[PDB]
Structure 1
Amino acid sequence: TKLLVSLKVLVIQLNPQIGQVDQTIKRTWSILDKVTKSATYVKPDIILFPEFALTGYSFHARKDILPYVTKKDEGPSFELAKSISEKFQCYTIIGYPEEDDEQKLYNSALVVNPQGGQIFNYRKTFLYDTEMNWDCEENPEGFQTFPMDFSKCAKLSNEDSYNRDVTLKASIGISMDLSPYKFMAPFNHFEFSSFCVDNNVELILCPMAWLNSTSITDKQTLHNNSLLEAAKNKIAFALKEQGLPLAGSQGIYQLKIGDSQRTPRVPSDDSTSEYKDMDEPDMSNVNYWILRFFPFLYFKLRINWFKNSSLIESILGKTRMPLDHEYYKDLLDSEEVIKDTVLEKTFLGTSLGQPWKFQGKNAILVLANRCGTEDGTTIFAGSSGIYKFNGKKSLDSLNESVELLGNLGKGLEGAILREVQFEVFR
């Protein structure tokens, strides 16, 4: 049986600065208030916030992030998501700094149902250089999936309305999860992308604090005060020329609610990474974000790979997580049988029994990336948007195996709403 699902996704893009939690709370209610007053407004089934959407991101010490850490079921972040879910009758996913009863710190993103009850708490699996500053911890469970009960969102292929309930097998990824492990692992791996394809993920939620390539990331520059001074002056002029403060744009909201304005497919080049046109998305990152989801993208060479039986040594040898990951604290030789899970495993989008496993299926990707600037050196690309993988039969936005349902600006706070329509198999 094949169910048709119609979901109403709402993504919030904020510019949270460290020490302005309450002010970010106020601006958030200001955005949601404007969203409901939209001409083409509809009640969202799921609302997604960026990574650390209320506290800020660039923390340099554990002592600094301590005043903002909360339990998974306590604090401003949890209270906000609970109020939103109860006020909109939807799921709320927001990134927050977490701390357990063992005094351990995490980069987490909590989830609340329409009833106002926390149904899931996810920890960041792959850590970024910034998490190392405040002694963050890798997700001991690694990549995870969870079910989401949506009411009146599905229907049969011959019905005239969505009066049926559907339990989607969701999955959350936090920025660095999309990148190669520690920026050192092979690019061809695609950890998080493979994990979602392997476990047949249908809805992908990605809270992010992704950077713009114009940011200062060079290590020898960040630790050379002479070079760092001249490097920060460049960032200062970049924002001053745009008529923006060093912290970034706040208060001025970009609202794309209800409209069906799709994002233009543009290839990567020079000036696609330039921090200009704050109402326009960052196609350099959008193309990169799509590339990181290669297993969901159509690729012609998969036929030759499956035929020549390539990657099978990669599929079998493929482990769940990196061996040196916190997750851990030959079938060809053995006489043990091949389990279903092994046949579900994939590499580069190819499986042991099929050239393109995702082929024929659909999946919804929701990226909620923050905007603004921090430390006068870190610029976030923003460009929050929603994507659809049709799985129908090009390693960027030019590939028509993915649908760009809409994106936000690279440097403006706002919220985008889209009525995503895909299909599922039960």
Structure 2
Amino acid sequence: TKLLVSLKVLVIQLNPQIGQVDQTIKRTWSILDKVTKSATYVKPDIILFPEFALTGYSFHARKDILPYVTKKDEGPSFELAKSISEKFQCYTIIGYPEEDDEQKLYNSALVVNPQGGQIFNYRKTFLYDTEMNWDCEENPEGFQTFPMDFSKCAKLSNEDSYNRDVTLKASIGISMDLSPYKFMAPFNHFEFSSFCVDNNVELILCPMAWLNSTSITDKQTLHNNSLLEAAKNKIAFALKEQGLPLAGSQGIYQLKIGDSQRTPRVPSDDSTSEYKDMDEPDMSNVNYWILRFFPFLYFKLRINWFKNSSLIESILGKTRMPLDHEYYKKHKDLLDSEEVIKDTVLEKTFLGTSLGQPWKFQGKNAILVLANRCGTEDGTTIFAGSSGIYKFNGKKSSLDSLNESVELLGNLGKGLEGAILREVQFEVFR
């Protein structure tokens, strides 16, 4: 049974700096006020914030992050999300640094329902270099899905209003979750997006603190004080030339509330990575994010992969998580056994192909919401901003925004705090 859904999605893009939690909260309430006063404001069903949205990101030691960590149901990030959810009768998702009862630290994202109740807490699964500075743990559950009950968001195709309720299968992926494991696994594993396709996820939510490539990431540079000073001067100049303070822009809000302006499809080139034009998205990163969701993208070659059974061993052989992942610290060849083939094996994909069809996602819909922070930290790290909303339409070979099986419903700029609201329409099957 086809069910039509209409979701009002609001993404908040912030430039949080370490030690400014109260100020960031104040700016958040200011943004939300401005949003409600927009000409084409409508109430959101879901509000998504970035990774470590109120605290800043680049913590260099456990001691430095400890004053900002909280249990999943206490503290500033949780209280903010509960107040937002109660004021807008929506789901609210925010990234925050978490401590549990056993003194373990995580990079997490809590989910609050419209009743102000915490319904989920997701922990980052693939860690980035920065997390290793302060003793962050990998999510022992690996990637996860969860149900979100949306009220009055759905209809049958012959009905004239969205008066039905729908429970969507959702997944949160926090920034590095989208990358090859440790940047060492093969690029074409696409672990997170494969997991979402494997599990028939419908709503993908990604709080991020994702870098623009102007950032200094070269390890020899970071650890040679001479090279680092020279590199930092380069970033200093690039910000000064833009009329920006070194930390980047704060408190000047770009609002795209309820318009329908789409993001132009563009290929990556030498210039699309430049940290210029703060109100325009970083298309180098937009294209890369889209690429990391390859299993959701139409690709002609899959018919040949399927016809030749080229990926059967890859599909059968792939494990739920990387073998060295926290996940297996759970229990790790159906071709050579008397055990039958289970449904779950027939749901498995590699490169978007399953044992049963060339492209498993074909004819389906999924919504991707990316909330990426903006600004700069340490004089070395420039976040890409460019928060956006995307629809994978499942319709039947560019590996970027030119691929028309993804729809770019709208993006914020790379360098300004702000908010984007889009009504997103798609279908699910029930």
> What TM-score range do you get, normalising by the shorter chain?
over 0.9
User: Which ranges of 4 or more aligned residues in structure 1 deviate by more than 2 Å?
Assistant: none
Aligned-residue offset at 1:38: 0.2
Deviations 1:340-370 (A, max 9, x none): 0000000000000000000000000000000
Q: Which residue of 2 aligns with 1:4?
A: 4
Name the counterpart of 2:243.
Answer: 243
- Among residues 316, 331, 336, which one is paired with 2:334 in the alignment? 331
Inter-partner Cα distance in structure 2 for 1:158 and 1:267:
39
SS in 2 for 1:25: helix
Cα deviation, residue 53, structure 1: 0.3
Partner of 1:346, secondary structure, is coil
Q: Partner of 1:31: helix, strand, or coil? A: helix
Q: Which whole-Å CA distance do the structure 1 matches of 2:312 and 2:257 have between them?
A: 45
User: Tell me, what secondary structure is at the counterpart of 2:152?
Assistant: strand
Deviation, structure 1 residue 134: 0.1
Q: C-alpha separation between the residues in 2 aligned to 1:135 and 1:285?
A: 28
Aligned residues: 426
* 1:422 aligned residue: 426
Distance 2:108 2:188 in 1: 26
Over residues 8-59 of structure 1, what are the superposed CA-to-partner deviations in whole Å (9 max), with x where a residue is unaligned? 0000000000000000000000000000000000000000000000000000
* Length-normalised TM-score, structure 2: 0.99
**SS in structure 1 of the partner of residue 169 of structure 2:** strand
Q: Does 1:62 align with 2:66?
A: no
Query: After the TM superposition, which of the residue ranges 175-184 and 326-335 deviates more from structure 2?
Result: 326-335
CA distance in structure 1 between the aligned counterparts of 2:185 and 2:309, rounded to whole angstroms: 24
Superposed displacement of residue 378, structure 1: 0.2
Of residues 342, 345, 351, the one that matches 1:342 is: 345
How many angstroms apart in 1 are the aligned matches of 2:229 and 2:162? 58
Q: Partners in 2 of 1:271 and 1:246 — Cα distance?
A: 22
Name 1:388's counterpart in structure 2: 391
SS in 2 for 1:350: coil
Instruction: Give me the whole-angstrom Cα distance separating, in 1, the residues matched to 2:2 and 2:84.
Output: 32
Distance 1:219 1:141 in 2: 31
TM value normalised by structure 1:
1.00
RMSD: 0.6
Give the Cα–Cα distance (whole angstroms) in 2 for the partners of residues 180 and 270 of structure 1.
23
User: Pairwise mapping of residues 36-47 of structure 1 onto structure 2 (< 5 A)?
Assistant: 36-47=36-47
Query: Following TM superposition, by how much is the alpha carbon of 1:127 offset from its aligned partner in structure 2, in angstroms?
Result: 0.1
- Secondary structure, counterpart of 2:65 in structure 1: helix
Q: CA deviation at 1:414?
A: 0.1
Per-residue CA deviations over 1:208-264 (Å, capped at 9, x if unaligned) read 000000000000000000000000000000000000000000000000000000000
Quick one: distance in 2 between partners of 1:256 and 1:242? 22
Distance 2:92 2:56 in 1: 19
Segments of structure 1 that go 5 or more residues without pairing to the other structure are none
Q: The residue matched to 1:130 in structure 2 has which SS?
A: helix
CA deviation profile, 1:64-110 (whole Å, cap 9, x unmatched): 00000000000100000000000000000000000000000000000
**Counterpart Cα distance in 2 of 1:217 and 1:139:** 25
Q: For residues 30 and 128 of structure 2, what CA distance do their matches in structure 1 show?
A: 31
Deviation of the 1:274 alpha carbon: 0.1
- Whole-Å Cα distance in 1 between the matches of residues 210 and 234 of structure 2? 20
Q: CA deviation at 1:334?
A: 1.1
